[PDB]
Symmetry: D3
Subunit: 301 residues, 6 copies
C-alpha cells in the first residue's frame, strides 16, 4: 500500500514576518517543520502514499504537528503523541542574507526514537525509506535508530534514500562523516548540498568520492543540481524565482526526486520535478507551505 | 543608590493574540517576562531605583531581554549575556477561562544562578532584596543562590522580600514547602495567593500559620487582599476592570506594595498601590506591559 | 464502529475581525462551518466516533473543508469533492449586537444532497443520525434526502436527531412548519431555540405541543435550557462568559448533548455538557473553533 | 434642500489597536474625525440632508477627509482643499480606563475658518446650523467665524445648535466661559456633558442656570441624559453596551437628537434616538465608525 | 458634461495577503472590482468626467462598491442598488505564477442589465462608451444590453471603445467570436491581450484580420503594447516594475489610453500613458488600487 | 570616553505597510527617526561610544524616542524630554517610485536647540561631531546652534563630520548654500548625495569645488559612492539589494564611514563599511531599523 516511509523528529517553526534581527521582532508566525515531515507532506501533496514515523509531545504543539500530517493524509500508523514536549526553533533572516537558527529541541519526545521505533512489517512492499542526517545527530538512540531503520528496509528490499542535511549546531563535521562512512553501505540514494560537501570534506570533489552511493544528487543552490546515475552525470536547471524562505527547499527537492523515481521517471524528469518542488518551497514562507499538489504539476514547466 | 534589587530567571513569553487553543494559533505575540523582571520593570517605571541580577544566553532573545531592561532603566550591573540560551515559554488562555503554560527553559543560561552570582557589596544600603519561589525551583544551583542571596542581604541590613509564585510544573508542593520552611527565617515580607496557600497548605489559614513572617500579604485575586503587619490585619479593596491577561498580575502587585513600602507609607496605601498596579497589568497583555508610570499614579483613582 | 453520523451542507464562513458594518471591513477571517459540520467536529474532539456525509465542490475552499474534516478525524467515507463549487457565507455583527448574514451557496455542490446520497448500510450500529432543519430547506432534492435519510436510520434502529435551525433566508415559517409536521414522526430527539419556536409557533409553549417528540430540548440562550424526557422536565443552568461569536453555539450545544447521550448519562449531565460546549464556542470566533476537547472536560467546571 | 449644515475643523485620528501606553504602540489605526464631521456623517447616514463647511490642507490626509465625506454623501459645496496641512491627533486609552490625547493641528489649513468662510445664502431654508465649542477655541479667526456663522443663520431663520465640547488643551475654562456668555444669546439648542459643566461651572446645576438656552440637553454619560424643553424636564434612559472607543460618542448623540428634531418628533424620541446613536458609536472604534444607518434604526431596540 | 461612460456588473474581490493556495489561507483582503468599475475609477482619478452604469445588490457589498464609485467621484446617475445580491469572487496567486479565480456572481443584481438599462440621453455629448466582453458573457439580457448600448451611443455620435477581456469561465471561445463578429461593426476602438488573440483565434495574426476596427490596441504583457491607427502600427514600451497583482492592469491600460484620446493625445503619448496606468495597477494589490491620480502624472516618465 | 557626538531634533515616523497613496491607507507603522538619531543608533550598534544631543517633548512619542536611544545604549547625558511636543512625520511610497513626506515638526521641543545646548566639556576627547543640514534649517536658534557646535568641538580638537541632507520642505537651495558657505571652514568631513549636488548647485562638479572640505564623500545612490581624500579620489561599490525603504540609508552610510575612520580604517574599508550600512537600512523598513550590530560585521562581504 505505502510507497515511501520517512522518519525523524518533527518541529514547530517560529519565524519573523519580515527580515530583521529576532530581537526587534514582536510577532512570530508558527509553522510545522522537520526535514522528514516536510518530505512526508510534500510527497502526500503529490499523490504519493507516504507514512511518517516519529514522536511529538503531549502538548499543544505536538497536536499541531499531528493535524498537519493527518490533514495532509500522511500515514501515522506509527506516529503518535508520546508523553513529553514537542521541539521548536526560532529562525531569523537578515536584510542582506545572513541567517541563524535557535533550537529548543534537546530532550523533546521526538528525539527519543530508538531502534524498533516501529513494526518493520510496516516497510513491506515499500519502495523507499527516506531519512535525514539530522535525526542521528539528535540522540544516541536516534543514531542507533537510523542505522537499524535502513537495515530493516533493505532486508525488505526497500531502497534507502538519504539526505545529508548537515547541521552545525547538532554536531561536528567529524562525527558527521563518521556516521556517513558507516551508513553509506545501505544508502541507495544520497542527497547532498554543495556547501555541505565543502564543509565536511572541503571540496565537493573529495566529498563525492568518499560518499559513493548508487545514485547521488548534489543540490547546487540556484545553479540547479547534479544527479549521478550509472557513472553518467546529469545536470538540472533551477527554477528562477525570488527566494522567500530557503528553508525546507532541500527537502522539497528530495521529495520531488523520490516522486520522480517512484513514478518511474527518467533521471531528467526526476531532476526537473525536484527543482520544481524546491523552487516552490523557496518561493514561499514556512518550512513546507509551498509544496505543490499533484493537480498543479501539469501546468508547471 | 539602589532601593531595590531583584533577581531570578529572565524569560520570553509567547502569546496568541486572543483566547483559544494554542494548536490552532498561527501567530504569537512576543513579550519580556520573568517574575523578578516584571517586578523590576514596574519599580523602574515608578521611579524606584531597582537592580536586576540575572543571565540571558548569548542569543537574540537574550538581547531582547537586555534591551527591554535597559529601555526601562533597570540597573544591569550584575546582569549579562553568558554562553547558552535564553529560556522561553508559551501561553494558552482558553475560551472558558482556564488556560495552560508550556516551558522551554530547562538548561537555559538563566537557570544557572548559583551562590556568589553577584558581588554582595551590591546590596549595601539597599532597602529590599526581592526573590520569588520560582528561582529556587529551577535547580539545586539556583536553590542555593536564593538562600545565599538573602543571607547576604540580611547580613547587609537589607529587607528580604519573597513571593511564593509556586509553579507545579517546576517542583512539587513538598519540594516547595521544604524550601519554604528553610527560607522563611530569612524572610521579612511574604506575598501569597490564596490558591498557592490552599494548594500547598490545605487551607489559607493553615498556610498563614506555617509561614508567619514579620509582614505577610495575601493576594486574594480581584477579591482584594489582606496585609498582616504587627498583629493587625488590614484588608485592601481591589480595583475593577476586565481580566485581559492576568499573567504577572502578582508581580505588578508585589512591586507596588514594595514601592509604597520603600516610600514609607501606611499599610492602607501599600495595599491600594499594590492593588492598582496589579489590576493595570491584568488589564493588559504581555507580562508587565500594563504597569503604570509614576506620572500616571497621581491621577489614577 | 461509528457512534454518530452527521449530514448536511458544508460551508465556509467569512468574518470581520471585530464588530461593525461589513461594508467598511477590509479583511475577512476564513472559517469552516456548516451546522452538521460543526456538530461533527465537536463530537470528533470529544472522542465520539462521528461520520459526516456531504459534498464540497472541486475547488480550493472545498479542499479546505475536506482538510479541516480530516484534521479533526471526522470519517469522510461518504464525503467527497464533486464538480461544482463550495458554498460560502459572510457574517456581520453590529456594534449594538444584532447582525446580519449573507449567503453565496445557491446552486452549490453541497446543496445537491438527494436520496441515496450515501450507502445506508453506513448507519448500521450507529447510535445517532444527526440532521438540521437547514438541510431540507436547501432544495427539494435535499428535502427528500432528509426524509430518506432518517427513514433509513430508523430502519436500522438508529436514533434520529434533528435541530430545527430555521433560517428565514432559506424558507418561510410555513415551508418550515410543513417540513416539521412531516419529519417529526421520524424524530426521537429535537433541539429548538426559543426564538425559532416563537417565530414559527407563536409562543414557545405552542411549539412544544406541536413538536412532541420522545425527547425534546429547548435552548433558551444563556438563560439555560429545558430538557423534556419522560413527562419529566429537567432545567439546566447555563455557563457564564461574554458573547464573543455565538454563531454555531447551538451546534456545539447539540453535539455535547448527543455525546452525553451516546455516553449513557443522566439528563442532568447531558444538559451540563451541552451547556458547556455551547458556551465555549460562543466565547470563540469562527463556527466551532472554541469546541473543547475530551482532555479539557475533565477539568472544566 | 439641506436640512442641516455643520462646520468646524476636520481631523485625522490615530489610534492604537488596543489599550495601553502609546509609547509602546508600533501600529496606528487611521480614522476620519472632527466633531462637526462626526455629526455630519451620522446625519448623512440617517437620511438627513447635511452640509459640512471646512478646509483640509492640500495633502494626502486632506484628500482622505474629502473622500470619506464624499463617500457618506455630505455636501462639500463649501468644503475644499486649500494650501496648508490637514490637522491630526493621536489617542491613548490606558489599561485602567483614563487616557490622553495629543494634537498636531496648530496652524493647520482647517483652523483658519474666519467670517465669510462660506456664502451665507447657503443656510437658506436650513433647519439647523451646528457648531461646537471646539471651533472658536482654535483661533481668534475661527472664534469670530463661529459668531458670524450663527448670526447669519439666525438672520436666515435657521436654528443654531452648539455642543460645548470643551477641550482644555485648546483654551481655559475662562476663555471658554467667556465665549459661552457671548455665544449663548444666538443658541437655540445646547448640548453639554456633566463633566464639562462641573469643570466649567462648578456643579451641573450652576452651569444649567448660566446657559439657559431655549432647549438644553445634558449628556450624563451612560447614566442617561436630561432634555430641558419648555419648563419640562424629560429624562432619557441610556443604552447598554461595553465602552469600546467613546471618542465622539457625543457627536453621535447630538446628531441623533438633531435628526429626531429635524424629523419633528417628541422630546422622548429625540433622547432615545440620541442615546442609541451615541452608544452605537461608543461601542465602535474610530470617531463615527459605529454610527448606524437609516435602515438599521427601524429594528434597533 | 460627461466625457466617458463605462458599464457592466461590479464585483467585490477577496484576495490572499500573499501567494499560496487559497486552502491554506485564513485572512482575505477585500477590494472592489469589475473591469468597467476599474475603468470608471481610473478615469476619474485622472480628472476625466466619467459615469458608471450598472447594478449592485441591496447588501453590505453593494454598499461598499457604491462608496468607492461615489468617493472616487464617478457619475452614478444611472447606477443604483437594486434588490438582490452583489457578486463576489476569490482569487489565488501561486508561488511560481499559476493563478485561478472562483466566481460567485451567477444571478447577482448586477448581471441583470438588459437593454434600456438607462436613459440614452445620458450619452449625449459623451466622447466614449467603454464596455468589456465580460458583460455580454453574463446574461442573455447582458448580451442584449451590450449591443443596444453602443448602438445608442453611436446614434449620439459617441465613439465605442471596447476591451475583449475574454474569460474562460464565463463562456467558450466560439460564443466569444460570435459576439465579436456581431458587435465589431460599431466598435471604434478594440482592446485585446495577446493570449486572448491566440486563445480565441489561435494566432495573433488571424485575430487581427477578423477583428478589424478603426483603432486596435494589443496588450502584449510586459513587452508593452501595439496600437493600430491609420494602417500605421505603433509600439509602446512597458514600464518595468515588479508585478504584484496583474489583475486590473488591462483595464488601467485601457483607461490610460482613453484618457489619452479624450485629451487629444498623439498615439504615442496615448500608449505611454496606457502602459503607465497598467504598470501602477500591476505594481499594487487589489483590482484598481494602484490607479494614479492626475496630479501624479507629470512626475511619471 | 565618548568617540562620537551627533546632535539635532529627533522625530517619530509614521509609514504605510505597503506602497500606495497615504489616502488609501488605514494602518501606519511607527518608527523613531531623525538623521542624527539614525546616526547615533547605527554607531552604537557598531560598538562605538556615541552620545546624542537634542530635545523631545513631554509626550508619549518623546518617551518612545528616549527608550530607543537608551536601549541602544546611546549617551543621553545631554538629551532629555523638555516641555512640549515631539515632532512627527508621515511618509508614503508610490508603486512606481514617486515619494513625498509630510511634516508635523514646526515648534517641536526638539526644534529649540540654541547655542549652549549642552556642556562643551562633553566634547572633550571626542573624535567626531556629526551634524546634519536639517537641524540649522529648523529654527534660527538651530542655525545658531549648528555653527556654535562645531566651533566648540574644533576648539577641543574634535573633527567635524557633516552631512548635507538638503530638504526642500525645510528651506530653499539659496539659504542652504548660504549656510554651507559659512560653516564649511570647520567641516573636516562632508557627506553629500548626488541629487543634492545638482539641486543646490546644478552640476555635481561646481558643487564639489565650492564645497571643498579636507574629506568629502558623495553618495551616488546604488552606484556606490566617491570618497575624496588627499586630492586622491576613491570609489565605492554599492551593495546590490532590493530597496525596501531608502529612508535613513544616507545616515547609515555616514555612520558606517565614521566608524571606519574612528577605527582607523583605510579609505577603502571606510567606504566598503559605509555602503554596507546603507544597504542594510535601504533593505529594511523604518528609518534605521536595518542598522547592523558589530557582531554581524565579520560575516558581511
Ligand atoms: N532561490 C531558489 N530558486 C530556485 N530553486 C531554489 C532556490 N533555493 C533553493 N532552490 C532549490 O532547492 C534545492 C536545494 O537548494 P538548497 O538551498 O541548496 O538546499 P538546502 O535546503 O539544503 O539549503 C536546489 O537544488 C534548488 O533546486
Ligand atoms: N481581574 C483582576 N482585576 C483586578 N485586579 C486583579 C485581577 N487579577 C489579578 N488582580 C490583582 O493581582 C493581585 C493578585 O492576583 P493574583 O491573580 O492572585 O496574582 P497571581 O498573578 O499570582 O495569580 C490581586 O491581589 C489583585 O490586586
Ligand atoms: N452568551 C452565551 N453564554 C453562554 N452560553 C451561550 C451563549 N450563547 C449561546 N449559548 C449556549 O448555546 C445554547 C444555545 O443558545 P442559542 O443561541 O439559542 O443557540 P443558537 O446558535 O441556535 O442560537 C444555549 O442553550 C447555551 O447553552
Ligand atoms: N459606554 C456608553 N454606553 C452607552 N452610551 C454611551 C456610552 N458612552 C457614551 N454614551 C452615549 O454618549 C452620550 C454622551 O456621553 P458622553 O460621553 O458624555 O459624550 P462625550 O463624547 O462628550 O463625552 C451619552 O449621553 C450616551 O448616550
Ligand atoms: N508586470 C508588468 N509590468 C509592466 N506593465 C504591465 C505588467 N503587467 C501588465 N502590464 C501592463 O498592462 C497591460 C496589459 O497587460 P495584460 O496583463 O496583458 O492585460 P490583462 O489585465 O488582460 O492581463 C500591458 O499592455 C502592460 O502595459
Ligand atoms: N538600493 C540601494 N542598494 C544599495 N545601497 C543603497 C541603496 N539605496 C541607498 N544605498 C546606499 O545609501 C547611500 C546613500 O544613498 P542615498 O539614497 O543617495 O542617500 P540618501 O539617504 O540621502 O538618499 C549610498 O551611497 C548607498 O551606499
Ligand atoms: O533544521 C532543523 O532542525 C529541521 O529539521 C527543521 C527544518 O524544517 C528542516 O531542516 C528543513 O530542511
Ligand atoms: O513562570 C515564570 O517563571 C515567570 O517568571 C514568567 C511570568 O512572567 C511570571 O510567572 C509572572 O509572575
Ligand atoms: O447557516 C448555515 O447553513 C450553517 O450551517 C452555517 C453555521 O455554521 C450554522 O448556522 C451554525 O449553526
Ligand atoms: O477634538 C477635536 O477637535 C475633534 O473634533 C476630534 C473628535 O472627533 C471629537 O473630539 C469628537 O467629539
Ligand atoms: O474577472 C472578472 O470577473 C472581473 O470583472 C473582475 C476584475 O476586476 C476584472 O476582470 C479586471 O480585469
Ligand atoms: O527628513 C527628516 O526630517 C528626518 O530627519 C527624518 C529621517 O529619518 C532622516 O532624514 C533620514 O535621512
Amino acid at each position: 500500500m505505502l510507497e515511501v516511509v520517512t522518519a525523524g523528529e518533527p518541529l514547530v517553526a517560529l519565524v519573523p514576518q519580515e527580515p530583521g534581527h529576532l530581537r526587534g521582532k514582536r510577532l512570530l508566525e508558527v509553522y510545522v517543520g522537520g526535514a522528514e515531515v516536510n518530505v512526508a507532506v510534500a510527497l502526500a501533496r503529490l499523490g504519493v502514499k507516504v507514512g511518517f514515523v516519529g514522536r511529538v509531545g503531549e502538548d499543544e504543539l505536538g497536536a499541531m504537528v499531528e493535524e498537519r500530517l493527518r490533514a495532509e493524509g500522511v500515514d501515522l500508523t506509527h506516529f503518535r503523541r508520546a508523553p513529553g514536549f514537542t521541539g521548536l526553533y526560532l529562525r531569523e533572516y537578515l536584510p542582506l542574507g545572513q541567517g541563524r537558527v535557535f533550537y529548543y529541541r534537546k530532550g523533546s519526545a521526538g528525539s527519543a526514537l530508538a531502534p524498533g521505533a516501529f513494526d518493520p512489517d510496516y516497510l513491506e512492499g515499500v519502495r523507499f525509506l527516506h531519512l535525514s542526517g539530522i535525526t542521528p545527530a539528535l540522540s544516541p538512540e536516534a543514531r542507533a535508530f537510523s542505522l537499524w531503520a535502513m537495515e530493516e528496509a533493505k532486508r525488505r528490499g526497500v531502497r534507502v534514500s538519504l539526505d545529508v542535511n548537515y547541521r552545525q549546531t547538532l554536531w561536528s563535521p567529524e562525527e558527521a562523516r563518521g556516521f556517513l562512512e558507516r551508513a553509506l553501505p545501505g544508502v541507495d540514494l544520497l542527497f547532498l548540498s554543495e556547501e555541505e560537501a565543502e564543509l565536511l570534506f572541503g571540496r565537493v570533489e573529495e566529498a563525492l568520492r568518499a560518499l559513493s552511493a548508487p545514485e547521488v544528487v548534489l543540490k547546487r543552490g540556484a545553479k540547479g543540481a547534479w544527479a549521478f546515475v550509472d557513472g553518467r552525470r546529469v545536470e538540472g536547471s533551477a527554477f528562477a524565482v525570488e527566494a522567500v524562505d530557503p528553508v525546507g527547499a532541500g527537502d522539497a527537492f528530495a521529495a520531488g526526486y523520490l516522486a520522480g523515481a517512484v513514478w518511474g521517471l527518467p533521471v531528467e524528469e526526476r531532476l526537473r520535478l525536484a527543482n520544481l518542488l524546491g523552487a516552490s518551497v523557496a518561493a514561499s514562507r514556512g518550512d513546507h507551505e509551498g509544496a505543490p499538489y499533484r493537480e498543479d504539476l501539469e501546468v508547471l514547466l
